[PDB]
Symmetry: D2
Subunit: 122 residues, 4 copies
């Protein structure tokens, strides 16, 4: 599997830092530090990955969540990243993400941002 | 907070069943059973929620992930749901989701489905 | 085809009004009036639809765009709706949408909202 | 405005070709040729852009639609791209997109792909 390939420190195009441990069972646990937004220091993350991916050259599906509350700040929001790990000399995690803020019902139509992050080991 | 409001069994518009425990610290843990797709029985989920939401009538941001591997099937894919819990007499979890499949690099452009699920307690 | 089924006035869950003419060639032209956001009166829309859909009970794919500039306001943003028309006694257009604002490069990560609108004829 | 900056031929990361004319009034018209998918030759596109963007360094919001029917093929689907044009020496159009296929109601949950394309003039 890709437990060893996924475990470690990853960096996205914004300079954010994603530190993760992949468990043998499919668990992802770690911390996230965003270079942008209403965020400071590390936030807990948890997620899941496919611990027995296909053997045909396909990537490894995974996802995780951060709720943007820690001991320093609370942005009343959560981001989920959904994507796939691609191994090899220039390994990457290619993701799309959804960032939902708590809103009133009147403002729920503008609650959710969407974007895409690519994580590398360098 | 909404630990007690979120903890329990939820059902979406497709007939899927979302069983979750909210921890005092922001953790979400539980199981998901999809009424649709290449899925059978329960799958592990994990996520996060805002354990100290705003007090102005806003919803409570949260997200979770399921990797679609269990002891029965492996769809080589993962879904993340990002959304907000809205309390009250007809409590709901309103979500948008991203479902990424592991793909070859040539097919990565068609790796990710997007949709929206509303969960109720009934 | 669904030229006659799509042409006319549609209303979404927010109270917005979508007035459209479907051309024999796949064109969509009309106006949109949003019940929410930094918007007033009607805005031009244009789009495309599948003018020869499948005959197996599938919906009819379509999409359109509004740039949120008219003679009254300019929100420096554009929404695209992507979805499908479903005919019958309770015809609907089920959509997902992406609303991008012009931003500086530093803020591009938070440029795009995502949501979902359902349009009915009533 | 950016009528002259947007008008012309653009290429994305997949090798697709986007040929567009921007009108003084906010119109986008042209053709799209996809390097991937169930697509051959050129397809009509139409969209809208902000013809009076902010002057603070922000990008120019725009969107367009392609229904994937032409004289050669019909994929019973439509893509909308929502994004912003960024001018300068290395001008770009940064987009996110939604690709909806016509589906039966039972399959509507898996009707829509999401992705991101960056277009350059080179
Ligand atoms: O590494 C990274 N960093 C970024 C990406 C995805 S997570 C993100 C880092 C997130 C850090 C905590 N939230 C914020 O600061 C934040 C700032 C502004 C907005 C929101 C959140 C938000 O919810 C929102 C929702 C709906 C309409 C508008 C808005 C906003 O205007 N990748
Ligand atoms: O309760 C629920 N159930 C559903 C929603 C969101 S999770 C979903 C249940 C998911 C169950 C496991 N996956 C599947 O069966 C599955 C079936 C078909 C496709 C995919 C996955 C997929 O990745 C995909 C990605 C890119 C292009 C096309 C495709 C597919 O054509 N809410
Ligand atoms: O009928 C409808 N009405 C609505 C939906 C989809 S179109 C929408 C109506 C749109 C009317 C013109 N824009 C706005 O007022 C507007 C207001 C607030 C925001 C934005 C735009 C925006 O871009 C944005 C982008 C990124 C981060 C945060 C933000 C915002 O906070 N369906
Ligand atoms: O330049 C480009 N090219 C690409 C991107 C965005 S447009 C795209 C080019 C599109 C060309 C016409 N459609 C296709 O061939 C096509 C192929 C496979 C699928 C679909 C469409 C689809 O709807 C879909 C929807 C829901 C679940 C699964 C599926 C598919 O598995 N940028």
């Amino acid at each position: 599997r890709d437990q060893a390939g996924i475990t470690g420190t990853w960096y996205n195009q914004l300079g954010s830092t994603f530190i993760v441990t992949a468990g043998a069972d499919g668990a992802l646990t770690g911390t996230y530090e965003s270079a942008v937004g209403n965020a400071e220091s590390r936030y807990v993350l948890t997620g899941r990955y496919d611990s027995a991916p296909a053997t045909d050259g396909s990537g490894t599906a995974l996802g995780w969540t951060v709720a943007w509350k820690n001991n320093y700040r609370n942005a009343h929001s959560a981001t989920t990243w959904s994507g796939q790990y691609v191994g090899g000399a220039e390994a990457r995690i290619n993701t799309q993400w959804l960032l939902t803020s708590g809103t009133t019902e009147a403002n729920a139509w503008k609650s959710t941002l969407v974007g895409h992050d690519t994580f590398t080991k360098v």
